[model samples]
Target: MLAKRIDAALILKDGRVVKGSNFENLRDSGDPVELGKFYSEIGIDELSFWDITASVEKRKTMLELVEKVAEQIDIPITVGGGIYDFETASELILRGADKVEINTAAVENPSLITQIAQTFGSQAVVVYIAAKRVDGEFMVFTYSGTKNTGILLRDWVVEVEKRGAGEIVLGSIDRLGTKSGYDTEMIRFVRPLTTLPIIAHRGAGKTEHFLEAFLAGADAAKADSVFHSREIDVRELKEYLKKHGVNVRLEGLGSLEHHHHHH
Candidate 1:
């Protein structure tokens, strides 16, 4: 079995690629599609565009943003946020999203997992869980961490898998935007709960964090601010991971020289 690769994430909140400290005080980076296009040619195995405000705002998927990004990036794009129904998910796919990520909706209606999976195949759906540490236990949060679902993290992971979710994204609300590192312990805890490919999200600030995530049983590692802040070069991250006994897709890194400059 090959090592799970890395995925770059562009978190779009209020129509900008923003990075924040502790997931609150957000600072604008730049255009999402522009950043996506730049990273697509860089080194990420896949790209995820999240409409951070969609579900909270009660809106539809960001079709315009998805269309623009899809046209610019050649890699697979997974769009999340505000995907409540089959129509919204289908529209995202038609607009060029390779996968539709469901969080709030899936939690509300677990059946939606199989509904989307049945329509678009399991590989086309990703279930995202926001994990918050509550009294020494990892609990689930929904609606962008505004609501605590009171469901044990382990329980939800199992239910999502049995319900037909193709993949799972475990995001740490505790470490969200903290840039300390990924929650490898959380990954390890949930790894055995489900056999589906798991994406470790949030708290990645360095190459070593990614390596730890993969070593802890995560199928892929995802980060936002580290790249937005240029703290870690995507090319160097992949190279370091490969050199450090981690399996990564180096072919996505087209030319080493291009990494000398940043967009």
Candidate 2:
């Protein structure tokens, strides 16, 4: 969460079909940069972007990248990185991003969530509920998964949802990169809070893990090292899930053209 995000994929789907962005902020670079083009040329259902910076000040540069990517791509782009306030969230929407991701700062200031929903609408603001297993219980953490607070995962989730958060990006820091799969146990805790939407993150090692994520109560799944390294192709994996009885979106399938689950 400290180091800047960077990648070098120049194209997605078929190399000759689309070109990737050169910037280091989320969708602005790497295969994700090409996800939009692939979805347009192919047929994707939905997609997301993580700015990956620490604070709004650092995100200033990311705003530029988001603007550029939004202009180039025609699919829904959800951008999340260091957005703590409604003003910043509003700036992202005005610049072209479909949704604004909120983390760390949101926990510190729950009112920000209401302000965002009231100003830009609840669906436009997604709260990041970073959860991790410490000692034994599933606890919520912040600051890029480095800080652990005593907040119960379900309790915090309910608070955010009641505050009008449109969606939740529930990240499992412990299971991240382990590929063991998403923590369904964690998902169950937050699932009862609200039906808005839940995006499970980290520990998606296989097609089965994705399935487990859905079973755990996630509407969508996100992976970082897995997707960035081509551990899995977005479409093929989603297709695998579809065959196994999972509902996959066309936009997500289209992203498979450019993004993959890497080893």
Candidate 3:
């Protein structure tokens, strides 16, 4: 079986696909649907779309927008934001999303995880942990990173899996859009708690960062800043990972391989 490829992220704020620094100060990235189609065609293994403020703003998810984006991408679409109940999760999935991600609601009521998992199967649920390094340990944050949940990161990691969440998206509040690199130590710290596939996110500045993240035990790595800045695309990034011995699923051999093959 092919290994999972590093996915691309499209974080939305107030309706536009935007990029933010440390999960704040948003700027225009592009039209979400257009970008989704482009990335899917270019070999992004999957796409994660987060409405960055829905939980905090106390609003329903951008369902219409999600459907539009989903229509364009061939890869799996994970939609998150304001997923407070089974009804919300149902609607998102019914509207073309393959999975529904829950953040604030999952922290506020842990039972929601089990309910959703039972209703839709654990494979349809992804729990994103927005964590911040505080006083040398990781603590989970919610509500778009404005409110810090007192739960220790490791504790939440163990609980989410036990609750039947099939996958984990571990994002760093401090590292969001910082372009420094991933929180490798953080991955190493919580990696042993569960056997679930963890997608390490944020602070990815270069291809090497993705390689480092996967080596540190992350099943997949996600980044917004590098792709938004035109620093790397999915194929080039996969090629780099391939050269470094990372078992990524490169859909096509890509231009680099084609170049060598022709030569």
lDDT of 1: 0.81
lDDT of 2 by residue, 28-138 (tens): 444554544553444344456655434445466666766877898776667765666677788888888887778898889998899988877888878888888778888
> Which 10-residue window of candidate 1 scores lowest in summed lDDT?
20-29
- How much does candidate 3 score in TM-score? 0.85
Give residue 152's error in model 1 in angstroms: 1.2
Error of 2 at 248 (Å): 2.1
Tens-place lDDT digits, model 3, residues 1-263? 34956777787877667753231122323677766666676667888887766444434448777777777667888888667898888888888889888989999998889988887889898999999888887999988888978889989999999999989998888887588899898889888999888999878887788888987889988776677666776678888888888787766434223334442
Candidates in order, TM-scores: namely: 0.87, 0.78, 0.85
The C-alpha local distance difference test score for the whole of candidate 3 amounts to: 0.79
Number of backbone collisions per candidate: 1, 14, 0
User: How would the candidate models be sorted by lDDT, starting from the highest?
Assistant: 1, 3, 2
- Candidate 2 has an lDDT of 0.67
Taken over the whole model, the C-alpha lDDT of each candidate is: 0.81, 0.67, 0.79
lDDT of 1 by residue, 162-259 (tens): 89988899998988758788888899999889889999888887778888888898988877767767788888988888788877777767742554
The segments of candidate 2 whose C-alpha lies over 4 angstroms from its true place after superposition are 1-32, 39-44, 53-60, 250-263
The residue pairs found clashing in candidate 1 are 181-203
